[PDB]
């Protein structure tokens, strides 16, 4: 199978630079052209620049957003396309995507995340929302995590480890003050809580921290 | 630079309707040489990569359902979809390759479905946030439709604005409806300072708003 694989992004300050990296295998690499496409939170979709095939001799396009700032570059040893990302502004945080093209059949990578800030790597306050303790049942109950002052994106949730998927409605981080704070909720059977347990699994890869948070009753 | 401009927006439509969008370029896509339109649509759904459904303006990519069909020649290009299904639900760009590439603005596609009232519940700050000195309140609005909603919040019978923050699902894939959170963030000594705090959730399924409560001197 085509493969693409995206690797090398993360935070860094306003001014800094970054090298991106495109892994790919299943393929001839030297065949094809090869993009740099991006997209930032909730945005369209803005084309970068490509790197041409062997028959054309490796040579590079950039749209006039990027061109003198951004370099694509590729090793055809190692089958691998690089994006070298200088004098980086805010503007410039998003998803990166590197995307095969030729002059159809369609293989992006997964994308890598860019987040051009001042502010730093802070592991989320994962707090447990419990029911109030003079709260009133029915047949479902609704429970959730807060997930709190985070940053840089992003966070996973997951409930009792997925079994509880079915329920489940994690919304989209937002930023406030210059950290993320997102949410998620669960809905069980009033019967399965709290006489089992559910807890919230969250991960923050940025960080290296990973908490579960069990939701007793108070 | 070639412009790309897509039509509408958004809309949405019931399942088995049929959709058409437009987009222009700002000028000819048709290679004199090859006869060709280069002109491709793309399919991007929510968390991933985008995935080719048209190149060529008319040509299908291997694997894609005859219901997408796209259209058009020189600057204006037409995608239509034969029997909407709900995991259509998707942004769908254009993408010029006549002359480097340019992507257009996106036309989203969300799904018609009956109305739906939220179902809502409220969670008093946990144990854990008021130890740090914050103080956030949540109230969860789940699977409700449509989009259009309105929350207010309270204390003691006062209406507060300041500190509040509110996310949005993308349309759920399983039943089309939406769900929303909403945090009100507090100090630990204001928080303290109060008893009684209501969310209120308006919606076109009722003319009487939807209230949660808690009182913390019960």
């Known amino acids: 199978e085509v493969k693409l694989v995206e690797s090398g992004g993360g935070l860094v300050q306003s001014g800094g630079s970054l090298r991106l990296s495109c892994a790919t295998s299943?393929?001839?690499?030297?065949?094809?052209?090869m993009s740099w496409v991006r997209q930032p939170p909730g945005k369209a979709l803005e084309w970068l620049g490509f790197?041409?095939?062997?028959?054309?001799?490796?040579?590079?396009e950039y749209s006039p957003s990027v061109k003198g700032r951004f370099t694509i570059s590729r090793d055809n040893s190692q089958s691998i396309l690089y994006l070298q990302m200088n004098t980086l502004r805010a503007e410039d945080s998003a998803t990166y995507y590197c995307?095969?093209?030729?002059?159809?059949?369609?293989?992006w990578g997964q994308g890598t995340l860019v987040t051009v800030s001042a502010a730093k790597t802070t592991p989320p306050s994962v707090y447990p929302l419990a029911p109030g303790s003079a709260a009133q049942t029915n047949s479902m109950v609704t429970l959730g995590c807060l997930v709190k002052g985070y940053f840089p994106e992003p966070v996973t949730v997951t409930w009792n480890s997925g079994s509880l998927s079915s329920g489940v409605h994690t919304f989209p981080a937002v930023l406030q003050s210059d950290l993320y704070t997102l949410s998620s909720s669960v809905t069980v059977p009033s019967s399965t809580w709290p006489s089992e347990t559910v807890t919230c699994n969250v991960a923050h890869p940025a960080s290296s921290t990973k908490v579960d948070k069990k939701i007793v009753p108070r | 630079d070639i412009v790309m401009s897509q039509s509408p927006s958004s809309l949405a439509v019931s399942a088995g309707e049929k959709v058409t969008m437009s987009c222009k370029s700002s000028?000819?896509?048709?290679?004199?040489?090859?006869?060709?339109?280069?002109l491709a649509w793309y399919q991007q759904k929510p968390g991933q990569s985008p995935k080719l459904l048209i190149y060529?303006?008319?040509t299908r990519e291997s694997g894609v359902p005859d219901r997408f069909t796209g259209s058009g020649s020189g600057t204006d290009f037409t995608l239509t979809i034969t029997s909407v299904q709900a995991e259509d639900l998707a942004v769908y760009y254009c993408?010029?390759?006549?002359?480097?590439?340019?992507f257009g603005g996106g036309t989203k596609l969300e799904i018609k479905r009956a109305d739906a009232a939220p179902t809502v519940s409220i969670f008093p700050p946990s144990s854990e946030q008021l130890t740090s000195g914050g103080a956030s309140v949540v109230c969860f609005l789940n699977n409700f439709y449509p989009k259009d909603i309105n929350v207010k919040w309270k204390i003691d019978g006062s209406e507060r604005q300041n500190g509040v923050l509110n996310s949005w699902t993308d349309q759920d894939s399983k039943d089309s409806t939406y769900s929303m959170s909403s945090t009100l963030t507090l100090t630990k000594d204001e928080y303290e300072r109060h008893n009684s705090y209501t969310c209120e959730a308006t919606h076109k399924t009722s003319t009487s708003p939807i209230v949660k409560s808690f009182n913390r001197n019960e």
């Open positions: 995307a095969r093209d030729h002059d159809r059949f369609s293989y």
């Open positions: 060529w303006a008319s």
């Open positions: 000028q000819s896509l048709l290679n004199s040489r090859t006869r060709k339109n280069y």
């Open positions: 299943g393929f001839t690499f030297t065949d094809y052209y």
């Open positions: 993408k010029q390759s006549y002359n480097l590439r340019t």
């Open positions: 790197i041409r095939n062997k028959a054309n001799g490796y040579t590079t």
